Homo-oligomer: 263 residues x 3
Amino acid sequence: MANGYTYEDYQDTAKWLLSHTEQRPQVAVICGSGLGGLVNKLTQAQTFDYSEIPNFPESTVPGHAGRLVFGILNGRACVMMQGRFHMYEGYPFWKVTFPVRVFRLLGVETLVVTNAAGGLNPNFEVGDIMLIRDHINLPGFSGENPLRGPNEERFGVRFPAMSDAYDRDMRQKAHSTWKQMGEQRELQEGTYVMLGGPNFETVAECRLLRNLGADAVGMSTVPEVIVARHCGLRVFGFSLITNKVAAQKLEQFVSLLMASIPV
Amino acid sequence: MANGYTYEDYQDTAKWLLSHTEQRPQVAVICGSGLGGLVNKLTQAQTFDYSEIPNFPESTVPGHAGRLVFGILNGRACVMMQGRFHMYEGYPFWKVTFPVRVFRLLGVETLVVTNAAGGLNPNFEVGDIMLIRDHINLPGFSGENPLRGPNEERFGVRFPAMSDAYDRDMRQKAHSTWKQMGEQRELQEGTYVMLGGPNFETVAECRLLRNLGADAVGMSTVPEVIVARHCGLRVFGFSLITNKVAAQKLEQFVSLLMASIPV
Amino acid sequence: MANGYTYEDYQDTAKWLLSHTEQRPQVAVICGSGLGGLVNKLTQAQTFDYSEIPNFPESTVPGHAGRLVFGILNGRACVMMQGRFHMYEGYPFWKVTFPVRVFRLLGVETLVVTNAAGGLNPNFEVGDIMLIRDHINLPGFSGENPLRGPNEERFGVRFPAMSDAYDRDMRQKAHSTWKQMGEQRELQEGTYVMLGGPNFETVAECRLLRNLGADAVGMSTVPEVIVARHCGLRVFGFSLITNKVAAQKLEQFVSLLMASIPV
Ligand SMILES: [Mg+2]
Ligand SMILES: [Mg+2]
Ligand SMILES: [Mg+2]
């Protein structure tokens, strides 16, 4: 589906935000299912319901508060999406990813994505935290892509590379930080595969996905990462393994990682 | 694509049907390609062309009569779709699956799906009947799903499970019944994979599908099963292997199975 | 997505072309990325910008000139698409494939497709030329197909076969011709897989594709081949391996092949 937002639309929203808060975050965090508590660590917090922000889509899924919260996390200025958007809600990817481009226009340089996923790797257990090393974009194979349509050169190039999407340096930082935390369970890492949803997978589908090389499965994140890389944002993320085919722990982990982010 | 039918639309159609026949079926059967003769076993039959039923889509494929027939099959009150709808016809899944929700609103509790499929399992031969044990929804991987869009809580939940889609008890019943039939060829069973169509598969595609764990391939059924499970219908079905990459026999088989359906 | 062009639309465009040139090509060639120089071998050339041809879509990708050139190539009357259309540009397949049906209505009998692709087969090296033996249509698995919607019987059948898409005889001709050329590097051949794009693949995606049996990957061609076969055109093509996950050479090769095309 071709994008319906104009560059000016993104700019209008960014301007509105800049004129409503003194906060100037360099980092943006998208909180997935059951990860909304991450905004509780914020100091000097300022909240905006998605409904009050011009052009913003709305979270219709339970567990997704639908609020944009600016604040200081571990001495770092951040902006968090307390809840996100999903294709299964009826949103084309250009709407699901709208905030990512707005963040770039606010001066954000790093995007942290989080989600709740089903574990396909047999070595994963419920409660595991998997650093996303790579992804498999199934909807993208059929053309469902947030970048579909005329390319906005002011954001990025026509054919963006995706092989280096998840920042290697941050991957290293995450592991070092996990060790400083003294966690008994090792920090997992792997490939996240996105499918449309909303129904849960069949066994045949799960076997298929695992054999495709996927370690975790979900219905989000990938489109946001694609748009982030297209506009030049540094990206890193984690999947909270909510079941085998921790949230508070991940929030703590992300808070410590703020200190490791460059700039 | 987001659903265009409102709950009331389904209700209007169900009401129209209830006011045009005294029949009150507990079972619904969708007859796929070359399986239209199944309506010939019906007693006290009452037919409605899809064109005369408010809100109903139309069968444009040859071999699909495009008629809804109520009647008694093996002493069981049934409603049969003599012909179905397919995505390749240009129908979004919310239109392809419209009748399933109407059946639920008529008081139907069990849905039997049938189709003609190409055999991927090398042990299948033309004329084989494969009980559907599981499915692989390729269109669903890219987001093409009848459940896409706002969830209608009056039908079902936001994230329905699909791993237990094909009723285990009916699976057992089917096998016992097949044995009572004294059939020389064993009743096959496996995973059905759906793809969009309308063109037939290439060899490379067939090898791919088989290696994905699929036993049979077609361009229908899966969306109907997803909608059925979402609204709570018991589901079971069969693929008539029309070629290696029986109709009358399957009709007889389905007639006997009526006695095995609960309620 | 259902086709938006009527049979008459294709006919109008074909009529316009026939009334603007004396050229009556029996062969059509679609020049992919970096293959636009092929029109330089044409004698008695007549060019039409896509923008001046009624109903024609427009090439928005760099390297795609967006011109239709009629001319004589190796004593053979040809019509070449100097640049093509892609789904990632925002075009549904029925627009991407519009020219193919116009060519059929001009009296064209053979379609030669070319593209630039990434090599998945580990035995391929940059600069390799891969004769397309078969394809894997990922978008087609989810229903994204140029044939989706009501079937135009005046073009072809409802369920066209695709297993024999790439003409075997031309495959043989290509190899014989390559040998006459005295090329030191062997002519490769294999399966081309199409995905939507526009972003480049991740490593996980590349491993997946290779394991699916694909030898080369790109974001075009497959839809054109499907439409060509549907309307009865003889089809053959090549992928120029532009990188491992020659243009002038391929142009020379295609020029020699004109003599091998039947009729
Ligand atoms: Mg404040
Ligand atoms: Mg009667
Ligand atoms: Mg001239």
